[PDB]
Ligand binder design. Structure first.
Ligand SMILES: [Zn+2]
Ligand SMILES: [Zn+2]
Lengths: 118, 91, 49, 76, 84, 95, 191
RNA sequence: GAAGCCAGAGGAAACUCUGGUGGAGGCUCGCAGCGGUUCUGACGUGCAAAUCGAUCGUCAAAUCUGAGCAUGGGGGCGAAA
RNA sequence: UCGUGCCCCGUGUGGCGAAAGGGAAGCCGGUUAAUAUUCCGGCACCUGGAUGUGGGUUUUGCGCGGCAACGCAACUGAACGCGGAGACGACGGCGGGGGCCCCGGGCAGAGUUCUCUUUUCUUCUUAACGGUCUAUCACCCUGGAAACAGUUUGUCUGGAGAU
RNA sequence: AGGGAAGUCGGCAAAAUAGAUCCGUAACUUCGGGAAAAGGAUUGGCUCUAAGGGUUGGGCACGUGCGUGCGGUUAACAACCAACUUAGAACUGGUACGGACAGGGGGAAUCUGACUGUCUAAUUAAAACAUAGCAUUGCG
């Protein structure tokens, strides 16, 4: 039995675009099959973790699949992870509350200064 | 079980480069490959990433430090005199 | 409490058992539809009309 | 190629306009029968147990759809 | 062969807005409206106006590209320029 | 002073150690004191102060780190924040 | 190397108040012994953010707010004009003239000491890492602290490969053959 | 068989000893590759305007190598012959 | 409509340069004297465009479910912005998968057979493209751990929440 | 054959050594090495023995194949499956046992260059060059 194979294209060099895997055909022969590179999982923009629920594809493969497959039904879904979204929400609320508090204290200090001047 | 009497981490160099140079490089190698306690999360997971770059594995914080140690004594004395100068300027 | 390997094997065995029951019930509903195929064809005809 | 597990869906597929032809494959070793309909994009296969009602499904299939039985040898 | 790009064929080539028609003919708005009335250039409606222009609204006027091409050869344009 | 009071509270009264149990005590409203370490993350610290402000609970900012807070509690692990539910025989609440 | 290590251009915000930026990354720059800091500022005139590249001082970290301007605080990583700092402070990336975005005290472990002020003509006397004394305009900017990565040269290179790897990215000539090892046609010291 | 780690035996502790684990080094034997030390070697109008045989150096890197590109004689390039 | 104008924006500047870098998409069987992932048959895929049918949404106008990680055939989205992918070193051991190698049984065929050998050898295969059920990391919920625990060949992880 | 460097400018060339298991291994030393130092014992075949593994499987009381409330750590037991190493013993052939192939001669010193590396393609590979380390000069 012939178990040795050849490249099926004219590139003879083992580059990153020249990945092959061995298959057996219904004709009983061993053969190579040229395969594309593995897709990379999309990652969070804040912490850099892999985003769960999102497929790992080559960049132009994402144009052929629908919107709910490419995203998670949440704010920043498919771009940020849930922990980072929670941190963003809590940070935004607390900073706006402290902005209101600082504005109130500045108004009180301005009123006290005006009363001292008058 | 102690395997080498004195070379320690410098035993990878064998008999090359001289005893004095091996002793000089040993301290820098030890202090650059040691683990350090993080000043942000408190865990012992700060390791050198590059030249003067120290990253914590747990809290993912990256700090600018010395070449082979996290903090330089000159930088610490600088922080102390900066704190007292800032206190003098504000007061 | 921490479970035992026998309990894990029992859980697994129930999992393939319920998968096999789902497959058998799908075969049964396909056979029933094949039995009532003529009424199905008439209903498809009615919907298209 | 796509497999249809619903007789109603297979009936609608056979009544689609792009259904050019249909064929019946008999596997007596497995004791099964297969209805394969050739549409524009997909070949749709319905797999049934070999039975008289599976044979009578031909009568429910549309008349204008040219249906043929698969021979034992695929002569070129 | 070479893969086509989006938005380079179909309704985008078939229609243009009034602003694009005016800029193509290099006319003022009164002259453009006068020429359209005199030559019988009628407003049109694409099936999807976003495929023609992403900033189109319900009040956006569309014309045929071939109609504007026909308007490009009208001798009254030089009459307008001579009068100016 | 604060370390001795914390140690006697550990010996006599009731505490919970950690962020989630401290939040649970603040939500229950039975928390009598909250201690937050110096090296606590600022977002977590602000959230704990907001919870204590809503629950009317005093907050002590421990000048040590989480390691030193755990050591002052007498445990062999770090502790970013803690909640004292029962003062016991100490006067840590009267301050 | 992606971008040169420069300050922001001297604008209205740095000239009259301060502007806050956030340190996103601390990165290794090939050929340079000192780490760089990516700091993102706000554009006062448009919606888009502006990313800058500074020489990271020791103690800077990701997620830290730094402040650049006349009214910025005296804190490590803050960029201040030299007229706003007291005597005895050490600064980094000192501008020779106000607006050249940093020229002095840039290598690892190095700093410039503010010796004194002369407010009559707006001059500042500074001490360079070489021990030289210089007089600069007081509106020249500097980042408070010491450049990170000090003690780099205390470690022996110990290997020709390590010297080669050092100099290959720095494009300096290596190996170096001696002039006395040459022929008289090649070097004045030849022979 | 370097750091790091585990266990046992001592030491008030730092450390000491023993048995393992681990897999570092411009470390080492050595195949291919690259190179070219020796032989009264072959060959000497040769297979060859530098080849052949045995032997040898090196073999995880200051290792070997393709394509594209840059440096041009008053020059270039040169671990410098 | 004072009808022959007004408003918005800043980022710059073009081309060439890789049959080994990046990159949208094709597999199997057969066929010639000589070509074949190119021809023939079957079965697919990508890109772009136009416009229908079914289904979906909507009288609470632009979906519903799950505490959550998230899921489901759909489920509006211009300017202006943010992020991810493309997109990346060398070496060491460990684990999973395909292919190959090896062992046993069986059908069929071939060889050996002075003697022995229920013997030796050969065929026993399943592509792209899809459906469906599962696969280390990681993440979520409960709960709060010293008599510390879990854990890898390699000692890392845990009140910043482990088992 | 015998002798064993008596040959020759010169042990040039050849011969001898060689794998693996075990015993053992000096001076000097930058303590890392030297070191496979040196010097020794053994190796075939056959018939056995021993050691080193994996998978599955626990009794009651109720509701009804799962849910609780208990009870027990001799499963320290059974059933099935599985592959390659290591050690020990007897017997037996012998002129040979790493039976071909494959495969360090070793040691005492001196000079010399620190080492790894590089060059005179086509007569010179080296104490030459480079190297790390050290020292000096110039430049804000
Ligand atoms: Zn995130
Ligand atoms: Zn940390």
């Amino acid at each position: 039995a012939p178990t040795r194979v050849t490249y099926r294209r004219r590139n003879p060099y083992n580059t990153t675009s020249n990945r092959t895997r061995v298959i057996k055909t219904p004709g009983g022969q061993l053969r190579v099959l040229h395969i594309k590179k593995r897709g990379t999982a999309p990652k969070c923009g804040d912490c850099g973790i892999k985003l769960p629920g999102i497929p790992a594809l080559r960049p132009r493969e994402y144009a052929t699949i629908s919107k709910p497959k490419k995203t998670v039904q949440r704010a920043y879904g498919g771009s940020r992870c849930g922990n980072c979204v929670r941190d963003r929400i809590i940070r935004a609320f607390l900073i706006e509350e402290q902005k209101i508090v600082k504005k109130v204290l500045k108004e009180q200090s301005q009123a006290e200064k005006k009363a001292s001047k008058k | 079980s102690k395997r080498t009497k004195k070379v320690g981490i410098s035993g990878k160099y064998g008999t090359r480069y001289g005893a004095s140079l091996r002793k000089l490089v040993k301290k820098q190698e030890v202090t650059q490959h040691a683990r350090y306690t993080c000043t942000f999360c408190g865990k012992n997971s700060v390791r050198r990433t590059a030249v003067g770059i120290w990253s914590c594995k747990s809290c993912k914080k990256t700090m600018a430090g010395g070449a082979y140690t996290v903090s330089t004594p000159a930088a610490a004395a600088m922080r102390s005199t900066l704190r007292r100068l800032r206190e003098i300027t504000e007061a | 409490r921490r479970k035992t390997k026998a309990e894990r094997n029992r859980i697994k065995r129930r999992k393939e058992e319920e998968r096999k029951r789902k497959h058998e019930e799908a075969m049964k509903r396909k056979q029933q539809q094949l039995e009532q195929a003529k009424k199905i064809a008439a209903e498809v005809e009615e919907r298209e009309r | 190629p796509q497999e249809v597990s619903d007789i109603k869906k297979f009936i609608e597929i056979c009544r689609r306009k792009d259904a050019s032809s249909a064929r019946i494959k008999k596997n007596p070793k497995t004791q099964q029968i297969k209805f394969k309909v050739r549409c524009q994009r997909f070949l749709y296969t319905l797999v049934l147990k070999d039975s008289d009602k599976a044979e009578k499904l031909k009568q429910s299939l549309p008349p204008n759809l040219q249906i043929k039985d698969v021979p034992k040898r695929n002569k070129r | 062969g070479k893969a086509k790009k989006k938005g380079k064929s179909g309704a985008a080539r078939n229609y243009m807005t009034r602003t694009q028609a005016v800029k193509k003919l290099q006319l003022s708005l009164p002259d453009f409206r006068k020429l359209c009335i005199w030559k019988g250039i009628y407003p049109r409606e694409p099936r999807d106006r976003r495929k023609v222009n992403k900033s189109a609204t319900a009040s956006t006027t569309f014309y045929y590209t071939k109609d504007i091409q026909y308007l490009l050869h009208e001798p009254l344009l030089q009459k307008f320029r001579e009068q100016k | 002073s604060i370390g001795a009071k914390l140690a006697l509270v550990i010996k006599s009264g009731k505490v919970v150690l950690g962020y989630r149990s401290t939040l649970k005590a603040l939500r229950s409203g039975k928390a009598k004191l909250i201690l937050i370490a110096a090296n606590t993350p600022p977002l977590r610290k602000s959230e704990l102060e907001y919870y204590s402000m809503m629950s009317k609970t005093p907050v002590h900012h421990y000048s040590g780190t989480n390691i030193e807070l755990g050591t002052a509690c007498g445990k062999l692990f770090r502790c970013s924040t803690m909640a004292i539910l029962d003062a016991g025989d100490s006067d840590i609440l009267a301050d | 190397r992606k971008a040169p290590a420069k300050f922001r251009p001297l604008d209205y915000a740095e000239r009259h108040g301060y502007i806050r930026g956030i340190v996103k990354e601390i990165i290794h720059d090939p050929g340079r012994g000192a780490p760089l800091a990516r700091v993102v500022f706000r554009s006062p005139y448009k919606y888009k953010q502006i990313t800058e590249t500074f020489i990271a001082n020791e103690g800077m970290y990701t997620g830290q707010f730094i402040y650049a301007g006349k009214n910025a605080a005296l804190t490590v990583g803050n960029i201040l004009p030299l007229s706003s700092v007291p005597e005895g402070t050490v600064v980094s990336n000192v501008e020779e003239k106000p607006g050249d975005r940093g020229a002095l005290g840039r290598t690892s472990g190095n700093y410039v000491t503010v010796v004194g002020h002369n407010p009559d003509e707006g001059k500042t006397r500074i001490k360079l890492p070489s021990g030289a004394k210089k007089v600069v305009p007081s509106s020249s900017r500097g980042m408070i602290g010491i450049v990170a990565g000090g003690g780099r040269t205390d470690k022996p290179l110990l290997k020709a490969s390590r010297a080669k790897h050092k100099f290959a990215v720095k494009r300096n000539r290596w190996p170096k053959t001696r002039g006395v090892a040459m022929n008289p046609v090649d070097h004045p010291h030849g022979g």
